[PDB]
Ligand binder design. Sequence first.
Ligand SMILES: COc1cc(/C=C(\C#N)C(=O)Nc2nnc(C(C)(C)C)s2)ccc1O
Length: 328
Amino acid sequence: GPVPSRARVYTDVNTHRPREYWDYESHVVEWGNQDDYQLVRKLGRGKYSEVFEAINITNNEKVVVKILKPVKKKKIKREIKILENLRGGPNIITLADIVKDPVSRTPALVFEHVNNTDFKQLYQTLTDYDIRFYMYEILKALDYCHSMGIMHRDVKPHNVMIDHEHRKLRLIDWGLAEFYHPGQEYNVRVASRYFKGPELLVDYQMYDYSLDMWSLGCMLASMIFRKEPFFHGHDNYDQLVRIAKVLGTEDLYDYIDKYNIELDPRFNDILGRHSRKRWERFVHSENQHLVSPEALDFLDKLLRYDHQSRLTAREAMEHPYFYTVVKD
Ligand SMILES: COc1cc(/C=C(\C#N)C(=O)Nc2nnc(C(C)(C)C)s2)ccc1O
């Protein structure tokens, strides 16, 4: 069988919390007044929700309303409980209210309003300094939620809201997030394809917070090299091949051998043999102003096959890449 694995940090946060903290199936939702919120416009529809801009008519302030699609009361209560546990943490989107939508017959989560610029256009204008700054802000959110026993499991540009005018960042969509319990096996069908960690792609279920750090590394690579997404697989198998063309196949075999994992035999005809590459080959005249020795070393220390070898969020915040970021 597979060799077990444990997070190297925040390992026992939930076992020493009171049961109510992580036992989300027993959570009792405190419902607000649905008539407080007037929907203004539909902003988007996801796999699991529709998102609206709205007005809170008790203060005439704009809010965002996420009306959940019908899913298991378990998955709904999980997201609600995680948002309440994390509320007020650095750069965590603030759940302001929860109401029963009378049309959908599902909960509608009310969030603080973030005046966001879409990552498609925003990523075209970010400077070297901008990228370091916003990476540091994401790390504050990830260290916070990891320190609170929670992994996000869906870190990607779409879930990082940035109000660039006020340099304000919020990590959103906690609908895939989970509580970390040592030795628990988790669903590997999380995260968007381009941001899935090697652990998901080789079907290793005993993963942890370090999954988020791979995803973050994928975002960093797309930003400093101006190639979004960086690992651009056509499916989940080709996704691992794309990673192995950069990190090399010998270290992939070291990874799966360490955890006594077996690759899907369908890789025998697609994976090939690939050397590990040096990150400088992705540097060119149109991205070099975003690349530094510190950026490449930081990236290299996030994008490890072995989830146990990646920088933690707190370690990442100590990295020289952030020395130039002005600290508040
Ligand atoms: C999909 O889960 C979530 C989504 C959100 C929020 C948004 C999304 N998605 C959001 O605020 N999207 C916007 N798109 N344009 C905006 C203007 C600045 C034009 C008003 S806001 C918050 C918490 C969640 O859990």
